[PDB]
């Protein structure tokens, strides 16, 4: 993303609720490889991304 030191990452989840696919833009944590599943939320496990 121009004018910005960090690279972004597009991460496609899917809407838990409408048949579709929400996509977002997380600031890439270092070690985000492409092809990672990224777990999100309260019960999520403690690792990178």
């Amino acid at each position: 993303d121009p004018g910005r030191g960090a690279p972004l990452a597009k991460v496609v989840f899917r809407d838990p609720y409408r048949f579709k696919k929400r996509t977002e833009l997380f600031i890439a944590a270092e070690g985000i490889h492409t092809g990672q599943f990224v777990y999100c939320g309260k019960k999520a496990q403690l690792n990178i991304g």
Binding site: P16, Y17, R18, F19
Partner: protein, 238 residues
């Protein structure tokens, strides 16, 4: 086997992230437009705040058992409809110039409708009963009336529905109503209500006049504040 083997089950599971969620009713998770949101949280404030006695009395009201006798009683007694009016005049025009007519008849006793009609004939002690609607919009217009009614010693009462009170008199709405006289035969039922009403109203005033009526929180807040008194009870009741 009257059961073709193919029709199976395919039972879905809507846990988080499992199969996609179905359609619940959401009426609390929906976007209530600016009239609704607003009218919704008038009714809330109007319980949340500490409401005054004079405005409280406009909650406590009659019950089915009493109300329905009242609205029975009035139904002998509603002021002449239009059309029904015309033949009161038209019949006297034919009866005058035919078979005698001094033409006072006897004006049969009827209701009395509006406020600045009622309040005069309450300030004149010319009323057996007064019915007042609770929900009246500027409450201004009927704040006093109870106070006034009990000072004159006139049985007042607070019925639900300015609509159904304003349906006796043939209109959209009405705030007050009154029986000044009654038909002789119909006086046992009137004096039956009157004594039943004013045990419950006119002879209460220092219970009504000093009862603030809101100061009630939200059940979400109450459930939490009470859940801390099971913490504080069960700290040193155990």
């Amino acid at each position: 086997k009257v059961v073709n083997l193919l029709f199976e089950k395919r039972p879905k599971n809507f846990g988080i992230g499992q199969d996609i969620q179905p359609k619940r009713d959401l009426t609390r998770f929906v976007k209530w437009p600016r009239y609704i949101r607003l009218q919704r949280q008038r009714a809330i404030l109007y319980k949340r705040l500490k409401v005054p006695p004079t405005i409280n009395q406009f909650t406590q009201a009659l019950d089915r058992q009493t109300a329905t006798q009242l609205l029975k009683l009035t139904h002998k007694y509603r002021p002449e409809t239009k059309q029904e009016k015309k033949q009161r005049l038209l019949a006297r025009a034919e009866k005058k110039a035919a078979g005698k007519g001094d033409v006072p008849t006897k004006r049969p006793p009827v209701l009395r409708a509006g406020v600045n009609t009622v309040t005069t004939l309450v300030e004149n002690k010319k009323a057996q009963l007064v019915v007042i609607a609770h929900d009246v919009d500027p409450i201004e217009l009927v704040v006093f009336l109870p106070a006034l009614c009990r000072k004159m010693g006139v049985p007042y009462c607070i019925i639900k529905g300015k609509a159904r009170l304003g349906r006796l008199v043939h209109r959209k709405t009405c705030t007050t109503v009154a029986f000044t006289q009654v038909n002789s035969e119909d006086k046992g039922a009137l004096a039956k209500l009157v004594e039943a009403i004013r045990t419950n109203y006119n002879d209460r005033y220092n219970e009504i006049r000093r009862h603030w009526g809101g100061n009630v929180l939200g059940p979400k807040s109450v459930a939490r504040i009470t859940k801390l008194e099971k913490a504080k009870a069960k700290e040193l009741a155990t």
